Amino acid sequence: FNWRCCLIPACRRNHKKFC
């Protein structure tokens, strides 16, 4: 997982806060 989510749009949309 890591910040990979931050790079993925559909994921960072719900985990913007992660980054």
Side-chain angles (χ1 to χ4, degrees):
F1 180 81
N2 306 79
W3 354 255
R4 295 171 59 201
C5 184
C6 186
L7 307 177
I8 299 170
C11 195
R12 70 79 46 73
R13 178 179 180 176
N14 301 253
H15 300 298
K16 203 306 300 174
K17 60 185 181 300
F18 192 83
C19 62

